[PDB]
Amino acid sequence: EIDPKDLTFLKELGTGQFGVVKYGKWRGQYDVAIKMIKEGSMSEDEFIEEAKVMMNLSHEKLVQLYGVCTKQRPIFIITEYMANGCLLNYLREMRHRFQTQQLLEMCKDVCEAMEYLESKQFLHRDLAARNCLVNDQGVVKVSDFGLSRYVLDDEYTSSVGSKFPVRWSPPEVLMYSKFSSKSDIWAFGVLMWEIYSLGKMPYERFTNSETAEHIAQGLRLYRPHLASEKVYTIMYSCWHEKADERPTFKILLSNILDVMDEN
Numbered sequence: 001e002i003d004p005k006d007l008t009f010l011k012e013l014g015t016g017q018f019g020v021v022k023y024g025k026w027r028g029q030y031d032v033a034i035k036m037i038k039e040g041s042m043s044e045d046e047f048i049e050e051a052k053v054m055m056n057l058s059h060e061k062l063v064q065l066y067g068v069c070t071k072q073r074p075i076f077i078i079t080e081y082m083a084n085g086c087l088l089n090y091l092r093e094m095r096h097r098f099q100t101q102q103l104l105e106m107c108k109d110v111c112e113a114m115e116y117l118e119s120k121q122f123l124h125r126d127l128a129a130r131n132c133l134v135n136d137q138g139v140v141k142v143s144d145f146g147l148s149r150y151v152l153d154d155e156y157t158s159s160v161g162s163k164f165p166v167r168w169s170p171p172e173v174l175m176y177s178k179f180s181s182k183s184d185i186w187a188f189g190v191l192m193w194e195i196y197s198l199g200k201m202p203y204e205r206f207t208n209s210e211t212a213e214h215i216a217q218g219l220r221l222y223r224p225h226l227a228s229e230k231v232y233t234i235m236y237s238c239w240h241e242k243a244d245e246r247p248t249f250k251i252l253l254s255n256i257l258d259v260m261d262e263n
């Protein structure tokens, strides 16, 4: 529990699934992001009840959840500030500057974080470039892991809602809501595709339902121009129709390192 008196609000950072987020400082020194949880937007009992485990996830490549303020309303969630914002806009805005080696390093950053979550049997559930953040040195970190579990918004929680991450979801999630490590694996493959396409939208011009139909018929995202064959083999392995044929993040990390070694 963070003492809200130790927080200094400084700047608006926009809005997310739980409402307003601000930039501020903790005890005058540490840059933080502060979510102000819109009333009615979150399953608050469930979150507070299970919030300890989320604070104890600690890894360089995870956006740290520093703590919470729950003695007043709205509740606050206080997290590690990342000066370059979310990965999707960072890709699109710096599109013409990236070398392929840097793209691979971004995939490695994310894969390390997910290997850690995997080892803790903790699911992200909404992995995507929009839910990765980039710090002032260009390091990518995975953000908002596990929070989808607390979203109260039928458009987000229903597989046919307008906000559900259909384009990051494997068949068993779209058909049966079967989340597992292997559905995070699928989403990581799509995230690699976002990185190597420099921030394009997956299945652009397809609706969500057409996307679902597409992928249920075996069809997959094309290889982006900047992805080598080896890289594409790695992201494609994430999209096996059968979940148990998909790799683990440990294997994916080994693959990425192997490609780095070869280069």
Ligand SMILES: CN1CCn2nc(Nc3cc(-c4cccc(NC(=O)c5cc6ccccc6s5)c4CO)n[nH]c3=O)cc2C1
Pocket (backbone or CB within 6 Å): 013, 014, 015, 016, 017, 018, 021, 033, 035, 079, 080, 081, 082, 083, 084, 085, 086, 126, 131, 133, 143, 144, 147, 148, 149, 151
């Ligand atoms: C000039 N730029 C302006 C944008 N800009 N942004 C920066 N940096 C951060 C943004 C956020 C942030 C802000 C608003 C919303 C959200 N996203 C969410 O709240 C949620 C995502 C999800 C996903 C699934 C389930 C529930 C939720 S709730 C975040 C990231 O958490 N945070 N931290 C940061 O450092 C730095 C900049 C400079």
